[PDB]
Amino acid sequence: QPDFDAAIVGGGPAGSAMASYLAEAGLSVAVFESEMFPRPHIGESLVPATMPVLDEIGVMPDIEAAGFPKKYGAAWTSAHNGFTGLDHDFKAAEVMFVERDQPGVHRDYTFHVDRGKFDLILLKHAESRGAQVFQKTRVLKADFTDPDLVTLLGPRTLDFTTRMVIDASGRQTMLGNQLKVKVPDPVFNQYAIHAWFEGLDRTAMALDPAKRDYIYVHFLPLEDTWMWQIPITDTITSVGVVTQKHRFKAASDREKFFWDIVSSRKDIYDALQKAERIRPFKAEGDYSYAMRQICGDRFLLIGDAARFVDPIFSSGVSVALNSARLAAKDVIAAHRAGDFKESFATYEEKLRRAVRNWYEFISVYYRLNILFTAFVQDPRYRIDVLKMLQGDFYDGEEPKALKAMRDLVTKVENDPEHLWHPYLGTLRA
Template sequence: MSDVVIIGGGPAGLTLGCYLADAGVPCVILERAQHPRPHVGESLMPAAIRIFKEIGFLPIMEAADFPHSGGVVYHPGGRTSIPIGYSEFPQEGIEQEYTYHVDRSKFDLLLLKHAENQGCRLVQGANVREVVFENGAARGVDAEIGGQTVSFPARVVVDAGGRATKIGRQLGLRRDHPVLDQFALHAWFLDVDRGSRATEDYTHIYFLPELRGWAWTAPINDEITSIGVVADRSVYAVYQEADVGIADFFLESLSKNKALKKATKRAERINELKGEVNYSYQLDQTCGDGWIALGDAARFTDPIFSSGVSVAMHNARFAAERIQTALESGDCRRETFLPYEDKLRADAAIWDDFIRLFYRLLPAFTHVVESPEHRASVLRLIQGEVHADTDGHVLEEMRGLVSRVERADTHELKDQLMDFPMA
């Protein structure tokens, strides 16, 4: 029997594996795919660097020659653009002023090899079919490997299997987001105009209010750029009725923001257009007797701030602490994991408000990003490093502006209020 069995060899599961191996805790990671496998989520936020350092992965990232990312530029729609450079906000424990854009198939493979070198046992091509429970407590998993069912008993089961939300679905704990019902289309392109030299290596985010969504461009290497469009499903339904196919819808979306239209004027798609649907949800519980869920398996909301990988890794860091406490004390009941769930819940509440305010009135976001007083907090928030006590003022500021615009009979921003319910 392993102490810990981890479902999923993505950033969450592999990072957890590294922390556990470092603490001498035997674990096995079961991954249904064979790496390298493609995955969405290519721009990393600075918060990930802290984890890379702790798990000894930073030298591998440096040697891998991924393009650097110096920051993010927001393009609200008109002529202005709002850049945020990571060098503006030196962060504790992070010496470098850049992060990376990654081809996820390469990044996840490197992390997988690193976890293996650190001492994790990895089984690829192992599709976890069921989490096994005894008297209400998780006791291991059954996985299908080469057509056979193989049991992996363990003292703690971790769901790091991403949006498949294995435990969440098995226990009926997965709840779709009450408002966000978006989908994303993305592919790789040649000949995308990356703009001025100062921000050519940044992630570019373009607001698309007409689609209740947004778009990204991010360099994959010197020539290839990833482009993605996020839209509300109700918006696409209208196009569908007019017989507009998904590829045409994608192309049309690129013309809905002036800066995006310019950047993609000559863009040529070089791989298949991929879709991601229905990805905003959370679990009612993120831990239970003998189990814990992390990364996308615990919750996921609109990826506009490119924070998914760093959030997954930070979840893994905290989960590793609780798992060690549970194994050392011999008490793997839900109570031992609860501090982890409480932190996730508090962060999720702030994050959810932030995203709702963002959609309700886009200028409320540009207002706080442009404000010297709030800019640093916004950077922390957008990379998922939420601090309820210090970052709440950003939300207050946004809320204040939204309610002033809502109450005013006339206001220059009135026509930018979107029909987007707050909590």
């Protein structure tokens, strides 16, 4: 007599994807979302590992019809020790996703996206495939009896019953907090400040005007600080700064600080000065964490609710989408067999490994800093580095690039006369 077979907390990319998979499989599914869509949300530039999932669940047409800017590649700018391919020294690197064959991907492009629209399309698509979706409905607790009662809408409180809970709460980590298994990263503590601008000329930063719809990461000449530049429409562009919380606390105000930091680079500063900010400044903080358990009897965690690290590689949505995919296979087998913790270990193992790679790849980047440019551009490393940049880490093998980069960061770190020793970033793992 439970209301649902599964209940999903949160309707972002993880939640919507999960529900859509579960409904196609024949389960009674509910999705609870405390907001009303469309709702603004950070995390806009996708990587091609999103696409197989979006195809599989049958939403690509609806995505294609939305008119999001296509993303053909990614670029880095800023302002040799045997490395080559460096046509522009360390002021520019570029890569195109099609340079490497990626399994499950048959296109040249993915998308940069207004998350408001993007999440709405996935959430309505979940409804079209059978899921019961409940907006402005906040889940307060999962009370663990033979099912779970979820306790939840305006002045009214209501309960619903499920055999299984799936936490897709993102950074609000509902069950992570409820069960007290959330662990903040002992090193990463970056802080993001961002906004949307209209009329920035994306040709400014572009070496070649065909590449101006790439994502641009702009390294700044401070410690562990950079900026993103992401197309949202022809005319609107999402810009954000990322730095250490300590820097932000070392200073005194969100706007003033954003511009101060951007002021470290004249060209971009002036370029942004030609634009009109179309949205208030929002901040993201305390977002690097993991969980000691990501599953238990009658629950599991997907998307940012299970982990998040740092958005330097634009992979968060692909992780949310692919964690949903993997978790579905386990939830479906558990439902059929009538048995909901150890039922979820395959999902756990495959996500632990996947996310270790992303993590370890990010730690290198920060130690490497600007030297990272060299690995994009040098052809011994370019294609391996691109595997990671594609979001492709759901494989047995340890990525070859991560080994090479780690080994090389070590040798540089230990040797104070190494040509690159002065260019090391200052955040370590």
